[PDB]
Amino acid sequence: MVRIIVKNVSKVFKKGKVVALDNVNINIENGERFGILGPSGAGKTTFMRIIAGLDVPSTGELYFDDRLVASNGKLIVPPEDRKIGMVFQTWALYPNLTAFENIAFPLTNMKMSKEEIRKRVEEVAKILDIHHVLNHFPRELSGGQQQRVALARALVKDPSLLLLDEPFSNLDARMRDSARALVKEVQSRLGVTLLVVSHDPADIFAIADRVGVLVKGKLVQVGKPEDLYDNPVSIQVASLIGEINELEGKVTNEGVVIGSLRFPVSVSSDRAIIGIRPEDVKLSKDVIKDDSWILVGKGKVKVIGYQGGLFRITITPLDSEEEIFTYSDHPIHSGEEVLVYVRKDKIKVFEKN
């Protein structure tokens, strides 16, 4: 319901010594599910606080649709005036207030009569399917119900934008699938623009249609999840977005040499970083007569693992310590020599520092 325009936004702390956000540019579309992925300290929370209006850019500007809301250290439209709902990592329900009371809290100063408050609370409660537990205290609620109450609370003032800062922390994994699914359902039910930030790539593929990767204050790449996955701008982005084998090698006329392996790609540097995802590796004791797979050389199985019903096979090239792992339905025992194949169009390559 609202477009978020971030133009050259920077944010400094410690009187300038720390640059938490550096020249961030991004246009989030109205009604879009947008995600930001980045390691601890990347500046995710700082970013979300600026969007919320709890902080302002040191330099640069922020627009909601065509409305300027903050500019170069100045707050133009305060948080209470932005039509935003928030669930932050530190979020907590007031333990001594019922579910009703928690959801109603934000309406305290909204000039609504008792009946208008009740109606609004019950309406959102129904949407989140917790109308029947409105009289419960948070301790009487399941983990799933607690999140539903927090969401209802964030949505009670009918916002155009919902902000989630690493919300799926209190959950495990069965609960994580459900919580993610709930976020998407609610976004569809209301049409809100959605921004979720996390250090967990699972949260991103699960919820966001477009994602920005944040590293040390810099937004290094923006695109659809699959675009970041297949065409990462760096080896660091490549591994942040998913599992990958990282290999260092020498660039030569034949390609990037790594022990007994030779990758048919190149960079304009002395050495290169090779990135190859597990699904893009295939091991075989015989030559594979299949054009979609490319032989890179001989390898040797170093160790095998088992998890999630699959075997994790780790090899090294001959005359190298570099590791390459991949998953398979069948095991190959350690010490065995094998042929290593890769999906050539899937080899990722970067100049080395």
Ligand X SMILES: Nc1ncnc2c1ncn2[C@@H]1O[C@H](COP(=O)(O)OP(=O)(O)O)[C@@H](O)[C@H]1O
Residue nearer to ligand X on the CB measure, 13 or 94:
13
Which one, of 64, 72, 75, 132, lies nearest residue 98 by Cα?
132
Place of tokens 């800062």: 165
Distances in whole angstroms, Cα of residue 192 to Cα of each of 162, 181, 239, 255, 304: 6, 16, 31, 49, 46
Question: What is the nearest approach in angstroms of Mg ion to the Cβ of residue 294?
Answer: 42
Q: What residue has token string 């792992």?
A: 325
In this chain, which stretch among 39-47, 146-154, 289-297, 327-335 interacts with ligand X, using CB under 6 A? 39-47
Q: Per rule CB under 6 A, is residue 42 in the interface with ligand X?
A: yes
Token pair for residue 90? Answer: 């530190």
Q: How far is the CB of 11 from ligand X (least distance, A)?
A: 8
Lookup: tokens for 294: 């490319």
- Count of residues binding Mg ion (CB under 5 A)? 2
Minimum CB distance to Mg ion smaller for 151 or for 197? 197
Pick 20 or 125: Cβ nearer Mg ion: 20
CB of 184 to ligand X, least distance (A): 23
Closest CB 75 distance from ligand X, rounded Å = 16
Report the residue number, 51 or 162, with the smaller CB distance to ligand X: 51
Concatenating the DSSP letter of every residue in 268-295 gives SSSEEEEEE-GGGEEEESS----TTSEE
By CB under 6 A, is residue 38 in contact with ligand X?
yes
Q: Can you tell me which of 5, 20, 240, 281 binds ligand X, judged by CB under 6 A?
A: 20
Rg over alpha carbons for the chain, rounded to the nearest Å, is 25
Kindly tell me which of 47 and 350 has the beta carbon lying closer to Mg ion: 47
CA distances from 86 to 11, 35, 163 (A): 21, 15, 5
Min separation Cβ 19 and ligand X, Å: 8
- Give dist(CA 138, CA 99) in Å, integer: 7
Binding mask 35-64 for Mg ion (x = CB under 5 A): ---------xx-------------------
Among 31, 41, 144, 223, binds ligand X (CB under 6 A): 41
* Residue 41 interaction partner, one of Mg ion, ligand X, none, beta carbon < 5-8 Å per kind: ligand X
**Gap between the Cα atoms of 77 and 161, Å rounded:** 15
- Under the criterion CB under 6 A, does residue 13 sit at the interface with ligand X? yes
Contact assessment for residue 198 and residue 204, using Cβ atoms and an 8 Å cutoff: yes
Q: What are phi and psi of 26, to 5 degrees?
A: -170, 140
- Contact residues toward ligand X (CB under 6 A) are 13-14, 18, 20, 38, 40-46
Binding positions for Mg ion, rule: CB under 5 A: 44-45
